[PDB]
Amino acid sequence: IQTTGTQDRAIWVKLLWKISYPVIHNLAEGTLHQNMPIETRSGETAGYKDMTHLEAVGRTLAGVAPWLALPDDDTEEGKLRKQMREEVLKGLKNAVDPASPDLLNFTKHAQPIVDAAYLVHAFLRAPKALWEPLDEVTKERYIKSFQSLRDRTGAYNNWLLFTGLTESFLLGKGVQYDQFRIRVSKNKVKEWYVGDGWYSDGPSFSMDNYNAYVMHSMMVAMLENLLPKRWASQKELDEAMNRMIRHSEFCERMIAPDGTYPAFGRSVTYRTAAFQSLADVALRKKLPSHVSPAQVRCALTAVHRNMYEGNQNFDKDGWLVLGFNGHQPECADGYTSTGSLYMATLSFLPLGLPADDPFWTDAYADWTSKKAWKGGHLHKDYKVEY
Amino acid sequence: QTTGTQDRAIWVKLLWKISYPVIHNLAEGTLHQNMPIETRSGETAGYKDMTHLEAVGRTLAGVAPWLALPDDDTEEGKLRKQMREEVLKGLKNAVDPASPDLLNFTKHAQPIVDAAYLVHAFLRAPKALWEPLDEVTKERYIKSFQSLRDRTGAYNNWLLFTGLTESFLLGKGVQYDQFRIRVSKNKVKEWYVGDGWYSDGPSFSMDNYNAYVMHSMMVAMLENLLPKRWASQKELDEAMNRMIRHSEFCERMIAPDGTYPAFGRSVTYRTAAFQSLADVALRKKLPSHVSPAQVRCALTAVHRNMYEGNQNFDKDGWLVLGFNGHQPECADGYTSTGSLYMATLSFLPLGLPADDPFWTDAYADWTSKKAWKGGHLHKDYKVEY
Amino acid sequence: QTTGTQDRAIWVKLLWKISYPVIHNLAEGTLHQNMPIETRSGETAGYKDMTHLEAVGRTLAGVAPWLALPDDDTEEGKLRKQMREEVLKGLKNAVDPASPDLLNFTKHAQPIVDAAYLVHAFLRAPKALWEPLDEVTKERYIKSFQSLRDRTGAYNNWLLFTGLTESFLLGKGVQYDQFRIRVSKNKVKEWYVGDGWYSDGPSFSMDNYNAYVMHSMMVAMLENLLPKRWASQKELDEAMNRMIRHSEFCERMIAPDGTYPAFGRSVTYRTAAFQSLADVALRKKLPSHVSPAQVRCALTAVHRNMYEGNQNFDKDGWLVLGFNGHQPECADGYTSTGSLYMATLSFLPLGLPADDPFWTDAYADWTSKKAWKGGHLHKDYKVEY
Amino acid sequence: TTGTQDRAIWVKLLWKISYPVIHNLAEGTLHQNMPIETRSGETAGYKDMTHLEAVGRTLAGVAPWLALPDDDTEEGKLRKQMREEVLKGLKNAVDPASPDLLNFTKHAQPIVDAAYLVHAFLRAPKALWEPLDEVTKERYIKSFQSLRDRTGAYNNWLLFTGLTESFLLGKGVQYDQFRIRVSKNKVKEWYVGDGWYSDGPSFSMDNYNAYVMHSMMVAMLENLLPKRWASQKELDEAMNRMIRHSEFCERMIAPDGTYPAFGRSVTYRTAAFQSLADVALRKKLPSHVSPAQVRCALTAVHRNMYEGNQNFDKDGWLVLGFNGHQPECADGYTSTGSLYMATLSFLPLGLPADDPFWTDAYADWTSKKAWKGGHLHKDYKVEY
């Protein structure tokens, strides 16, 4: 029994709302610090307290932004989009308001480097919906907030993209940016490419979801910012773009016939963020020839329902819990807390395609593994050299 | 749920279902007369020169551990006894100049690959499959392996094929190629990219060839090199630990429904995707948070999902081109019927005896099966070695 | 042949000849007024914004060790105190916003390079050249160094300039850029290719830039990071031994006639090609088969062949574009008069006191001078660290 | 001086080096008469390998000169005399009855010097290979094929077996495809930049880029090209890397005609200039480096090293050292036969006497110009 693309879209909307609205509405009401849980594996909240809310806000907005970039209309979904966008804009104003209880932390610890970069990515996926409407004083505060990060740093790995993307955003805004951060993060990430659509997360190859969590989406987004200033070439952007496209094939292929996907590597608590590269490629209308938009929609539909339709991944008040499919704090990394979990929005990027795009209107289609395992047509795969 | 005893009888049944047509036909000298030469295009020229050694080498590499067990009086023991005798008969025929089943070693580059799988069979069961051969046949295999040195293939995992063969000749006390051993070992080490993965040649390739070739053969080669001082104990341990780490990903990619993703080239090798998991389990080197029982139960579900029904077999019981079903469109141009017998390579845990904890411990869910129903989920993390 | 004492007086004369015009004009506020701005193209636009910091930073980085010596009233002691007082005066001028010799830190990427050489002077003579500065002047240099963070240059040895500058700021207890230190340290370590050589950026460059920048500044940077646990003692030892190794080649390339090859880019930097040799010598870390006296004597010959005559000097005592002579055809487009004061960087041994054995041991032929006469030639061999 | 006088100096010095090896081999008295000097004084082990070292290393350097057509000049008479003695010694060297039968089967070392012998055959095929009788030809093919049971270091040694197999490929006999494929790919991977390879996994600042890597990579690739074991771009790449490398070697000749002693195997002496001599012979010098200044720089080197007797023993054999008797700088693997690398800087004698390399007016080399205030071409590392 299949669903239609229009039914699938409605499901995604319900599920994305279920994930993100607690974060967005509390931020808008100024009650995010007050109400969000701070669940950690250890149970300690010290330290986590200073960073988890920027984690929730940046990671949530990074995933809902394409949806909120769509032009307004009077349809039912269009009303939901308008409402969430208004609450987001209200929370974004609070988040840098010194009188707001939800003033977010940018000045302390290395962690905000990460989450500022996901916030920046939201601004890049929806400039006209989420950045341009901000009043000038709010805009200037975000500029200074991003510039204040430069006295700290994180690991020698995918973290280079966080500070690289942030500076590339500042460059795109015509404000003062750090050329060193832009240059070394680009070249380093290029040196870390190991083949067949995969980078190493730092000097050693890591078989995990971090290529989807950080590397492809942000390498591409950063290079796009750098092209007009000639800080990167079209060749470099096409290169990173095609490596993301290739990576998305493996990620669509690892969705099983039952709609599950393997749990592997660190930060498994990010759940369907493991599909951000497939979600980004779908949003950009760049799926490879043999991988239909419908089959990606349907594959990610099954995964979305498998992980967010029931309440196994949510607490009594609708917040995400530590775990994978269930309350499983034993798989949370020591650096993870409740706000970290909002990477979960990053598979919902194709809601930034309009409701009349083929991704949402083509008929249901089995995905690769589902075809493979019932004897259907199974396209030949092969590693690439670019 | 089935018991571990029942699981073993299923693996026996399905490993027999796969391997017996190759083994019995070679035993009877009718493998050339009887084995299909299915290709995606349908052409059989060229393929016909190489496909029968593919079937034999790949089949034997996978059944060799089972056939290595000590004999006993059980019903399974009789099956082992019967199969081993037919293998020994086929191996004599395979290098007999007057047998219609004489195998090709001199034409094409492809024999380099499948001689290495046969060598791997000899290495997994030396007392059972090599030593009982008569000396004339042993000498013929020695010369057959040495005659491979005029050709070569791709600059990738293929280097392990010739390194492993040469490490076998070394281990046998006959003349071997030191250059093949020195460069193959060093290049494979240079291709390690991290977290249990090698690049299949200069460029990383997200596929099953780390399982098909690289881990098992690098470990097995270093095992031959070590007593002869062509590798150090630390080099062996390093390759061993890298294979063990790799088997973690492979156990984790078995889904709750017993399936696993179809990705990368040579997907027609089916469950050979699990040779590194199977090699680690046979070696009883599974990390402490991955129970022997969950590996048994995971691979049982995969084995039944791929081999219990007949979707992957033709009317005569031979493997067909595909993944789960008749899917010729996913077969590489280099693949034929004989190539498909990689399918044996997930059955190495039959090389543990019936009373090993792998086969007696109670049923256990595997990693994703637990993860997806809210059960306990061990935290994973990339390693640095 | 000369004695050590006559060699020291020669080096003092020649270092003074090179450096005094820069230092004395800076002290007098007349550096911008009097220093030529000679370029291959003949253009001064752009170059005039940067060429004076180049002059100052490069001159100071090379005279710093000598000025670090304790004071005494010998004829040389008088010269050291005269020059030090004029450096201290010029350094105040260089950041005084009303001084005519105010230096540029904010325009172009080039200040990143020459601020680093000025930092290196401060690192080589902290009690002589940094501590005596007034607090306003100190804070100005701190702010100047931090204002560089909006620019960058080439993806090569330049990473050490910003890495070393930030390591100085860290050592001064002020706000420093951690990202700059982390990636510069790791990238430069990644560019080590072997036998005492780094690649200048991603592709190996057979030129003098290992001496111009990489060894001396890697070591000095790790020295600053060590007490703050931003580098290990193992990392510093590695860099130190790599520089020691590198100096062996540089001492071996001085010919029996006291010349050395002209090769690679920025050949106009003249004896700065021997900075790693000079640095290892000053640190009293020459390998056992290379005596201090043979380094003194080889570098004395080079120093006299390059600086005693006036072939490399214009009518006013400034350095000219060239190698040994007026040779603007070999000057890079990025080079001007100020750039040439890299020539000080081989006089680091003057930072060893006048009774150090480098300056008192009997004359000794250097490696190639012995080799080409039939004398003892120590066996060389590439190293694995 | 004139290039014609220089050329006569090179002929005389090349003969001074090589004629002891060649003449004794043609007489069958090489084993009897050649010393086996070592730093330790031991001769065991060395005695099994050092003679092929002298023959292979000598012939690799004299081969271009002996490829020249015969003519009635005085120099022509010397070439035909030397060539005929080489052909005689070559027959002897694989004659199972000859006292100068060379070892190919014992130790790893013959892998090296068979490659140098192969390089002599590649450098002068019509003069030193074709005239050999068929049975002697057969014996060499077998001797080269018998090397496949042994190997040496994981470094420049790969080129020895690669070049040898490419020779067998070129002769249409049975060859090792694996040796050709891996040696080609490994050496490409060891290229670090600016005309230098690492000698194995770790970069080594020494003369082995000139000793082995450039000339043998290029020669091997030329054999592979027509058989589709290498492409034209691959050959062009290795050629341009050799050409770039010769610039540094030409620049390290000092104004006094010396050059720095550095790195291992320094006892090979002017073989440090094989890549320069090879590019000169190939007439591929970069446009700012005149053939004449190369001729003249190497004449100063060749005289500083070979005109006097500081590098020879009482019987005209090379002795261990650099410039003088300096056995303290010889590696433990080096013996008397090893020293005949010294021929490898003489390749441009393979240009005829009327080539511009030998008739262009005297010119100062790069450092001689630079140090007297002459013109100095701007150098810059390359990216290919």
Residue numbers in the entry:
A (entry chain B): 38 to 423
B (entry chain A): 1 to 385
C (entry chain D): 39 to 423
D (entry chain C): 40 to 423
Show sentences the authors wrote.
Here we show that components of a (PUL) from Bacteroides caccae have activities consistent with comprising a unique pathway for depolymerization of chondroitin sulfate, a common GAG. After prior desulfation by an endo-sulfatase, BcSulf, to produce unsulfated chondroitin from chondroitin sulfate, the depolymerization pathway begins with the activity of a polysaccharide lyase from family 35, BcPL35. BcPL35 activity is coupled with BcGH88, an exo-β-uronyl hydrolase, and presumably BcGH109, a confirmed α/β-N-acetylgalactosaminidase. The most unique feature of the pathway is a β-D-glucuronate dehydratase, BcGDH, which we show through structural and functional analyses primes saturated non-reducing end β-D-glucuronate residues for hydrolysis by BcGH88.
BcGDH is a member of a large family previously classified as glycoside hydrolase family 154. Instead, the evidence using chondrosine as a mimic of the natural substrate clearly supports that this enzyme, which we refer to as BcGDH, is a β-D-glucuronic acid dehydratase that converts the terminal β-1,4-linked GlcA into a terminal Δ4,5-unsaturated uronic acid and, therefore, renders the sugar a substrate for BcGH88. We solved the X-ray crystal structure of BcGDH and refined it in the spacegroup P21 to 2.25 Å resolution. The resulting structure comprised a well-organized tetramer in the asymmetric unit that is predicted by PISA analysis to be stable in solution. The structure shows a pronounced slot on the surface of each monomer that is slightly tilted toward the center of the tetramer (circled region). An analysis of the surface residues of BcGDH for conservation in the family revealed the residues in the slot to be highly conserved and likely to comprise the active site. Residues on the surfaces making up the quaternary structure interfaces were not conserved, possibly indicating different, or lacking, quaternary structures among other family members. Based on this analysis, we chose to make alanine mutations of 10 residues in the putative active site (E74 A, R78 A, N176 A, N177 A, W178 A, F181 A, Y229 A, R285 A, Y289 A, and Y354 A) and assay them for activity. None of the mutants had activity when using up to 10 mM chondrosine, despite displaying thermal stability similar to the unmutated enzyme. None of the structures display an active site architecture consistent with typical glycoside hydrolase activity (i.e., potential acid/base or nucleophilic side chains in appropriate proximity to the substrate glycosidic bond).
